[PDB]
From Swiss-Prot:
Domain PPIase cyclophilin-type: 1-162
Protein family per UniProt: Belongs to the cyclophilin-type PPIase family.
NCBIfam families linked: PRK10791.1
Molecular function in Gene Ontology: peptidyl-prolyl cis-trans isomerase activity
Protein known as: Peptidyl-prolyl cis-trans isomerase B
Organism: Escherichia coli (strain K12)
Catalyzed reactions: [protein]-peptidylproline (omega=180) = [protein]-peptidylproline (omega=0)
Domain of life (superkingdom): Bacteria
EC number: 5.2.1.8
One annotated GO biological process: chaperone-mediated protein folding
InterPro entries cross-referenced by the UniProt entry: Cyclophilin-like_dom_sf, Cyclophilin-type_PPIase, Cyclophilin-type_PPIase_CS, Cyclophilin-type_PPIase_dom, E_coli_cyclophilin_A-like
Keywords attached to this entry: Cytoplasm, Isomerase, Rotamase
Modes of activity regulation: Inhibition by cyclosporin A with a Ki of 25 to 50 mu-mol, a concentration 1000-fold higher than that required for eukaryotic PPIases.
Amino acid sequence: MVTFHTNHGDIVIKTFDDKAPETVKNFLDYCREGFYNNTIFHRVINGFMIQGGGFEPGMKQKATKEPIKNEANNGLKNTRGTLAMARTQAPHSATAQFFINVVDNDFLNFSGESLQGWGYCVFAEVVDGMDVVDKIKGVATGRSGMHQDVPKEDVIIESVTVSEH
């Protein structure tokens, strides 16, 4: 279990370790090491998703570890409340950034091991705190340089709690 302690409340997450083993290992390593502490949700698009795990207040992008294999061929779907890894164009480019689907986003789902089909790897889901996710998704946003949909007031992950068996 992972809990993001945000300045708007707790987001409580169950991870799908066996379905996305490299992804969950990467995520938990960042959690346990404090990487997500003092990071923001820097991209909030109502009716789509909320994204974080990369920037400190002031839009300061942190150094990450090397990227991970895309495990989206695990059959898990980007339904409302799931977490998936953000990434750039290359399939195996995810590092620390993740997003929470706020509606079902079928168009993000894996359809093939290809540039257009690889999709976005689901590795966890919110089990409590969707009210907090729903508060975040409705905040006022604007531009920061190249970035769009940046909350005008910082939505901050202050700390995390990891519990494992």
